[PDB]
Design an enzyme around this catalytic site. Structure first.
Site, PDB file in Angstrom:
ATOM      1  CB  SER A  98      97.188 -47.041  73.349  1.00 33.54           C
ATOM      2  OG  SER A  98      97.985 -47.957  72.606  1.00 33.54           O
TER       3      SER A  98
ATOM      4  CB  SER B 296     100.876 -48.775  75.903  1.00 34.00           C
ATOM      5  OG  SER B 296      99.750 -48.464  75.074  1.00 34.00           O
TER       6      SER B 296
HETATM    7  C1  LIG Z   1      98.461 -47.496  71.394  1.00 30.78           C
HETATM    8  O1  LIG Z   1      98.062 -46.405  71.034  1.00 30.78           O
HETATM    9  N1  LIG Z   1      99.539 -48.125  70.880  1.00 30.78           N
HETATM   10  C2  LIG Z   1     100.234 -49.191  71.603  1.00 30.78           C
HETATM   11  C3  LIG Z   1     101.537 -48.505  72.020  1.00 30.78           C
HETATM   12  N2  LIG Z   1     101.086 -47.294  72.735  1.00 30.78           N
HETATM   13  O2  LIG Z   1     102.176 -46.538  73.297  1.00 30.78           O
HETATM   14  S1  LIG Z   1     101.735 -44.977  73.565  1.00 30.78           S
HETATM   15  O3  LIG Z   1     100.519 -45.054  74.339  1.00 30.78           O
HETATM   16  O4  LIG Z   1     102.897 -44.524  74.293  1.00 30.78           O
HETATM   17  O5  LIG Z   1     101.574 -44.403  72.251  1.00 30.78           O
HETATM   18  C4  LIG Z   1     102.330 -48.158  70.764  1.00 30.78           C
HETATM   19  C5  LIG Z   1     101.555 -47.156  69.907  1.00 30.78           C
HETATM   20  C6  LIG Z   1     100.125 -47.614  69.634  1.00 30.78           C
HETATM   21  C7  LIG Z   1     100.004 -48.584  68.444  1.00 30.78           C
HETATM   22  N3  LIG Z   1      99.961 -48.009  67.254  1.00 30.78           N
HETATM   23  O6  LIG Z   1      99.940 -49.806  68.587  1.00 30.78           O
END
Ligand SMILES: *C(=O)N1C[C@H](NOS(=O)(=O)O)CC[C@H]1C(N)=O
Length: 263
Positions: free
Chosen positions: A45, A105
């Site tokens: 992310s 995110s």
């Molecule tokens: C990005 O890494 N993602 C989207 C979302 N991010 O949240 S975090 O930044 O708090 O980890 C969920 C995890 C991740 C994904 N695997 O999609």
């Protein structure tokens, strides 16, 4: 060649059971601390910062790009869509999508940013235009988070991401209004308190973007305003040998604490 801070990060890494990458830039004197600074890591992310910055750059030559609506369809939803799911069969503006991607995110929002840039290669092209020769975005959400050891797709190095984050938030890669908007968005991140921030004194102000993925990949990239000091830029990337490894945000906090104690 091996500083005291680097020796401490090496001891942290040894006890962590994974691979740690750190890049600090202290804008008080432009000095750098690097640990595995030229090894590639999966961004997950944290790549959303580059995509949002690229759309901000587009907005410098377009009257009201950020107010442009983007349709959200049921089929657009992916694995983590806390904002976009509320707007299915409706629209979100590019400003709303940028805020959702950075602060919550939202992976559907990130895919809209990628599409607005012409696909993952369009995000990579923006990185090249601001002097980042290392960043590569290869896939959309959610497969850009596979984080497979040895896989160069959707990776960068700590050195390159710290320099880019500095140019975007503190330098002149963006216009003044756009740089301020990016910093405002990062400071309003909701997901960061267990990561770099946890290792820093409460009085220091942080704007950051976290990430995580398979292989226990646990990431954070931050701009830090210490009390009474010029800002820092700090990248902490961490990944582990087995695909179902647990997240280790405490390792990022520990690395940030080592950096803070070494200033
Ligand atoms: C990005 O890494 N993602 C989207 C979302 N991010 O949240 S975090 O930044 O708090 O980890 C969920 C995890 C991740 C994904 N695997 O999609």
């Amino acid at each position: 060649q091996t500083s005291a801070v680097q020796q401490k990060l090496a001891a942290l890494e040894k006890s962590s059971g994974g691979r740690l990458g750190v890049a600090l830039i202290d804008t008080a004197d432009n000095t750098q601390v690097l640990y595995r600074g030229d090894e590639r890591f999966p961004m997950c992310s944290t790549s959303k910062v580059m995509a949002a910055a690229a759309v901000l750059k587009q907005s410098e030559t377009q009257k009201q790009l950020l107010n442009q609506p983007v349709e959200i369809k049921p089929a657009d939803l992916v694995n983590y869509n806390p904002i976009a799911e509320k707007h299915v069969n409706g629209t979100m503006t590019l400003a709303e999508l940028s805020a959702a991607a950075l602060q919550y995110s939202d992976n559907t929002a990130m895919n809209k940013l990628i599409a607005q840039l012409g696909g993952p290669g369009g995000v990579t092209a923006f990185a090249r235009a601001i002097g980042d020769e290392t960043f590569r975005l290869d896939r959309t959400e959610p497969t850009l988070n596979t984080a497979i050891p040895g896989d160069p797709r959707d990776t960068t190095t700590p050195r390159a991401m710290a320099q880019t984050l500095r140019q975007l938030t503190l330098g002149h890669a963006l216009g003044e209004t756009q740089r301020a908007q990016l910093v405002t968005w990062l400071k309003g991140n909701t997901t960061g308190a267990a990561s770099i921030r946890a290792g820093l004194p409460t009085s220091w102000t942080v704007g950051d973007k976290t990430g995580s993925g398979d292989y226990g990949t646990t990431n954070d990239i931050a701009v830090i305003w210490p009390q009474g000091r010029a800002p820092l830029v700090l990248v902490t990337y961490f990944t582990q040998p087995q695909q179902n490894a647990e997240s280790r945000r405490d390792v990022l906090a520990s690395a940030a604490r080592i950096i803070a104690e070494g200033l």
